[PDB]
Design a protein around this nucleic acid. Structure first.
Ligand code: AM2
Ligand code: AM2
Ligand code: MG
Ligand code: MG
Ligand code: MG
Ligand code: MG
Ligand code: MG
Ligand code: MG
Ligand code: MG
Ligand code: MG
Ligand code: MG
Ligand code: MG
Ligand code: MG
Ligand code: MG
Ligand code: MG
Ligand code: MG
Ligand code: MG
Ligand code: MG
Ligand code: MG
Ligand code: MG
Lengths: 65, 65, 116, 151
RNA sequence: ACUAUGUUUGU
RNA sequence: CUUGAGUCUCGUAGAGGGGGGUAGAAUUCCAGGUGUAGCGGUGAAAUGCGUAGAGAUCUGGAGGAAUACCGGUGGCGAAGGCGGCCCCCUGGACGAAGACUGACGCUCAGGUGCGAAAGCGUGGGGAGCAAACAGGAUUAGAUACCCUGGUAGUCCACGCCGUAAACGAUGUCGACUUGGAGGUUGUGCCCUUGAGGCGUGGCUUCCGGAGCUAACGCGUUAAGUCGACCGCCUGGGGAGUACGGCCGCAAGGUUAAAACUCAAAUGAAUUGACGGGGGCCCGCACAAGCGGUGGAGCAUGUGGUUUAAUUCGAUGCAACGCGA
């Protein structure tokens, strides 16, 4: 986040824009803009885990490509 | 893979700041075990040690103190 | 109008407006501009272009202090958190370091309710 | 349209001056298929433009077009329920099309004795940037400058 | 951004 | 008698509970410095705040609440629930090897206890949020959604209440019946060569076999095959209502009908249709243009009004220079 910049400004702005993205500060802020009921938080986490349960072995199909 | 289970540390010491640093991000956030490869048992020990080190001011809570 | 060579650029970027404030490195403000102050009322206030114009309008009116090096402390979400920095560098400032100073609680106060 | 991409219709150039660009301007000014009537109008108007300016017909016409050619235009676009005017750079072929159309509508409006006089007068005022067509291009540039916050 | 409604009864 | 059940020895994991203390971030407020005309908010606005100095920024201080990351279809708990860190008190579970007791077990009407949130009482506390309420909007109206505020409450202690889609909509206990892929937590052996291999437990997630099921689906954590005991159902409404009893400060809870009325009410799945659902692709559908209509006069056709008759028919697109 605290990005000291090397000679080129543009590559520094990329480094800062990347450093923030890995820190997830924008995602942090968007989530804390409003209160989420613990029902919603648990429901969202469970739904994310279900979709995160993506079987990568389902690519065993011809499809005639 | 998990370094702690590799060396059989068997108790993660909060006073070992050197190895504690490579488990916190640049902002001081604790890195998830799914990134460092640490086992669940040691990740819980790791989090407790980091929080203890934060309290003793051996590690920063954030990068913006 | 005392000369300051090292300034800090505080970009208060929000979803509705962008506020740019140039301070010295002790916190004392020297000049400021906002997207809503540079024209751009309503929907145009919350665009990255308006924030860039605010950075220019803030780079000028602080030029008299003769700042050449700027720390950047950007805070908050919003379209004007990179356009302001780019405009600041385009205005002839040597950016020294860029910091995201967005206030992140540690599960503190309860946020307002979700809008329906 | 949605799928079918158009190959441009070819325009035969004007007889007197052999200009592709001028032939298009005759088409813009043509009414009711009377291309002969339109051809005389712009041929008459061009030669009074030549005499009252000092350059040739093509050079005088080019000067007027340059002062009326737009560079950026707005288009009402949508994201959600937005409806903002979005400034977009005009492609070079549309720049000439817009300039010719703006000159012709301005010439029709400015009441004189003849259309050739109307066209010659508006073409001259465009050369010195006083025409209503120049006014409209200023409005377009002004309107696209206000909404430069969108891209 | 944000409109509401659609008379009763058959083959 | 030892297999069920229980006790002891060693160890393990855990947001399990109760009581104290403490840390950092952030919000708000208070005081001050710099500084200046906006800030804030929305779809757009306005209410609101601001030259009485806002917002922004910096310093100091107060206070309350909650504990970012870790964090995980991870863990613990009978359930409700429980996550910053530290200490004190304390419950349960599990594993290895033995020893011990010797059906001491299972279930459980009444009974008793615990039991989210809201709510209630007493006393504190009160940052943020926020029923009520007020204002601004929106709208035909808007007792709403949105905005600006804002009281109770949310917090603490004690005492009530005793209800939730308190849900796995799946009572408890026990036995048996193919597999696969994980997670968590022990433990035995072996090449531990290093997080490994082969077993063996506990708890967990997904898929799936037989079987079952109306189907969906469940499928060794069964909704399969059985046994024990308990609870409950008997069409939809009326009605979880009335009355009565009990409980409660109250709110109300609990137990719990009848008359009357209907021929249904329901579940799952199927085809279609529809969606201010999603994806993809088209069309003078938009877009880009050109020329019109709606205004005038007339022609013509329709309504209507009039008439003795103004013949009949055509009426959204797909009737109205239509049958003609
Ligand atoms: C591991 N068994 C699961 C069970 O676990 C529950 O009982 C366990 C007892 O130990 C608990 N450990 C656990 O925490 C608790 O959740 O909950 C049920 C809930 C039921 N609606 C159904 O959902 C299925 C849906 O019916 C179906 O439509 C969908 N496709 C998939 C769902 N699993 O199947 C699961 C499944 O049988
Ligand atoms: C050898 N690999 C593993 C072993 O690790 C350890 O094994 C030895 C101790 O025995 C040590 N010497 C060795 O250093 C150490 O690596 O721990 C066991 C723990 C056991 N509950 C089971 O869990 C799995 C089960 O299959 C099941 O519980 C679940 N589905 C998935 C679990 N991973 O399988 C693993 C697996 O056998
Ligand atoms: Mg009505
Ligand atoms: Mg004996
Ligand atoms: Mg009972
Ligand atoms: Mg109780
Ligand atoms: Mg409560
Ligand atoms: Mg109270
Ligand atoms: Mg409100
Ligand atoms: Mg109930
Ligand atoms: Mg629950
Ligand atoms: Mg039930
Ligand atoms: Mg299954
Ligand atoms: Mg069943
Ligand atoms: Mg009752
Ligand atoms: Mg169009
Ligand atoms: Mg007409
Ligand atoms: Mg008329
Ligand atoms: Mg007729
Ligand atoms: Mg008829």
């Amino acid at each position: 986040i605290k990005v000291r910049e090397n000679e080129p400004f543009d590559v520094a702005l990329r480094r800062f824009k990347r450093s923030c993205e890995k820190a997830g500060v924008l995602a942090e802020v968007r989530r804390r803009e409003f209160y989420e009921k613990p029902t919603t938080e648990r429901k969202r986490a469970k739904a994310s885990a279900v979709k995160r349960h993506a079987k990568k072995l389902a690519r065993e199909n011809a499809r005639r490509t | 893979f998990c370094r702690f289970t590799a060396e059989g540390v068997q108790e993660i010491d909060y006073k070992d700041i050197a190895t504690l640093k490579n488990y916190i991000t640049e902002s001081g956030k604790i890195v998830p075990s799914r990134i460092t490869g640490t086992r669940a048992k040691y990740q819980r020990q790791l989090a407790r040690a980091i929080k203890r080190a934060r309290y003793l001011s051996l590690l920063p809570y954030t990068d913006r103190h | 109008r005392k000369q300051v060579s090292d300034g800090v650029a505080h970009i208060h970027a929000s979803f509705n407006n962008t506020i740019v404030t140039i301070t010295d490195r002790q916190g004392n403000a020297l000049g400021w501009a906002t997207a809503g102050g540079s024209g751009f009322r309503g929907s145009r206030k919350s665009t990255p272009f308006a924030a860039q114009v605010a950075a220019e309008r803030c780079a000028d009116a602080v030029k008299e202090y003769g700042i050449k090096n700027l720390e950047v402390m950007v805070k908050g979400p919003g379209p004007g958190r990179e356009s302001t920095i780019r405009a600041l560098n385009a205005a002839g400032f040597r950016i020294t370091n860029i910091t995201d100073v967005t206030p992140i609680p540690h599960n503190g106060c309860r946020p307002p309710k979700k809008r329906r | 349209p949605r799928r079918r991409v158009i190959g441009q219709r070819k325009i035969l150039p004007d007889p007197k001056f052999g200009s592709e660009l001028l032939a298009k301007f005759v088409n813009i000014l043509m009414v009711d298929g009377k291309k002969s009537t339109a051809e005389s109008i712009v041929y008459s108007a061009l030669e009074t433009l030549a005499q009252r300016s000092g350059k040739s017909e093509l050079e005088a016409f080019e000067v007027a077009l340059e002062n009326v050619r737009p560079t950026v235009e707005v288009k009402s676009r949508r994201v959600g329920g937005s409806t903002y005017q979005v400034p977009v750079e005009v492609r070079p072929v549309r720049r000439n099309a817009l300039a010719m159309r703006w000159i012709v509508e301005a010439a029709r409006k400015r009441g004189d004795k003849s259309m050739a006089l109307r066209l010659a007068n508006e073409l001259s005022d465009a050369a010195e940037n006083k025409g209503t067509a120049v006014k409209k291009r200023e409005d377009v540039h002004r309107m696209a400058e206000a909404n430069k916050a969108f891209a």
